[PDB]
């Protein structure tokens, strides 16, 4: 018996193929990605800015490297600069400027191995970027994904520019989040393994240093799919989009089974993001390829881009 709530969901915008990676930059502007946009059967994913007032869409970037289009899927906003870090299933990790210019971060990791296509990412408060990589090698390699075979990896892009594969053998690692102690120190890394209906955790000992891999939680349902994107609220409750279940699961700090479920007026929630300093959660979903918003019980946990480099406390 798990309590379920049915809050009012308000449509923001639609017609965004594979709507994913909702994020707010330092100016408060809202962005999302459309990974499934295609031109002539070839990838032509886009990064869009959405006007929250009218809901009008503006494509600011259509990533492409050497004639190979991208499949942008997840985002995080930087702190020291107002730029976006985008996980791309075809191009790896991208840094995108608000004027639409972009740069591909790496073609190979620290060990010289070819970079894998990424899906989502999360910054810890020290500025390290944790990334899931469910795809195979980046372009120009043939596109493939670990939906059946276990070749999905996890990366950590350190503050000193190193791209380190921290673990592998995942069956489609998807959403990812970092739990911090009250003193702001990175404590645990939570990784969603979609098809297996599992949420995994690691203890963070330092930059690109994780240990004690554990099955942290279980996603409900026997439907095809499972945990996609996720984020923490200010009380460290973890909200997880359960693709294919019509619900967003709410886990307590200790994980295990959901302590609560949120019913959505659609079947495929993909990701979510809190509007800075509010209880408003923006949700992307793949049933109607649209963006919606609803009010949670409390404010979200501050993202890295909201913290101060030169603060006192």
Residue with tokens 């020290």: 126
Question: Is residue 99 marked as binding?
Answer: no
Do strands 4-5 and 260-263 pair parallel, antiparallel, or not at all (unpaired)? Answer: parallel
Q: Which stretch binds Ca ion (CB under 5 A): 3-11, 104-112, 143-151, 272-280?
A: 272-280
Contact letters for Ca ion, residues 230-249 (x by CB under 5 A) = -x------------------
Cα separations (Å) of 256 from 90, 174, 260? 33, 18, 12
- Residue 142 beta carbon to Ca ion: minimum distance, rounded to whole angstroms: 21
Q: Which stretch binds Ca ion (CB under 5 A): 199-207, 228-236, 278-286, 289-297?
A: 228-236
Q: What is the C-alpha to C-alpha distance for residues 306 and 18, in angstroms, rounded to an integer?
A: 27
Size of the site for Ca ion (CB under 5 A): 6
- Residue 98 beta carbon to Ca ion: minimum distance, rounded to whole angstroms: 18
Question: Is residue 142 marked as binding?
Answer: no
Residue 306: phi and psi, rounded to 5, are: -95, -10
Rule CB under 5 A: choose which of 174, 194, 242, 246 binds Ca ion: 174
Tokens read off for 216: 């942290």
Cα separations (Å) of 47 from 27, 72, 75, 285? 17, 7, 10, 16
Question: 180 an active-site residue?
Answer: no
Q: What is the C-alpha to C-alpha distance for residues 130 and 155, in angstroms, rounded to an integer?
A: 6
- Asked if 77 and 59 touch (Cβ cutoff 8 Å), the reply is no
Is 273 a binding residue for Ca ion by CB under 5 A? The answer is yes
Active site residues: 286
Binding-site residues from annotation for Ca(2+): 20, 119, 174, 228, 231, 272-273
Binding site for Ca ion (CB under 5 A): 119-120, 174, 228, 231, 273
Binding-site residues from annotation: 20, 119, 174, 228, 231, 272-273
């Amino acid at each position: 018996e798990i309590p379920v709530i049915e809050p009012l969901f308000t449509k923001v915008t639609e017609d965004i193929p594979g709507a994913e990676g909702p994020v707010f930059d330092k100016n408060g502007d809202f962005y999302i990605v459309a990974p499934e946009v295609e031109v002539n059967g070839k990838p032509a994913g886009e990064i869009l800015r959405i006007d929250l007032k009218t809901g009008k869409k503006t494509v600011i970037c259509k990533p492409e490297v050497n004639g190979y289009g991208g499949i942008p899927a997840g985002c995080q906003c930087d702190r020291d600069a107002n730029q976006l870090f985008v996980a791309d299933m075809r191009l790896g990790l991208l840094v995108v400027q608000t004027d639409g210019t972009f740069e591909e971060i790496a073609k190979k990791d620290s060990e010289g191995r070819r970079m894998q296509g990424c899906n989502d990412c999360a910054f810890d408060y020290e500025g390290n970027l944790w990334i899931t990589a469910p795809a195979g090698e980046v372009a120009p390699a043939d596109y493939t994904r670990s939906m059946q075979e276990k070749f999905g990896s996890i990366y950590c892009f350190t503050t000193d520019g190193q791209m380190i594969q921290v673990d592998t053998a995942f069956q489609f690692p998807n959403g990812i989040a970092v739990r911090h102690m009250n003193d702001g120190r990175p404590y645990q890394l939570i990784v969603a393994e979609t098809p297996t209906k599992k949420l995994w955790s690691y203890d963070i000992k330092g930059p690109a240093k994780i240990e004690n891999k554990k099955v942290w939680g279980h996603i409900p349902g026997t439907h095809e799919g499972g945990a996609d994107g996720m984020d923490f609220d200010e009380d460290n409750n973890l909200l997880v989009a359960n693709w294919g279940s019509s619900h967003i699961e709410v886990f307590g700090p200790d994980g295990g089974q959901p302590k609560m479920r949120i019913r959505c007026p659609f079947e495929k929630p993909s990701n979510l993001h809190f509007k800075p300093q509010t209880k408003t959660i923006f949700v992307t979903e793949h049933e109607n390829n649209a963006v919606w918003k609803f009010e949670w019980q409390r404010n979200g946990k501050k993202q890295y881009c909201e913290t101060l480099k030169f603060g006192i406390f």
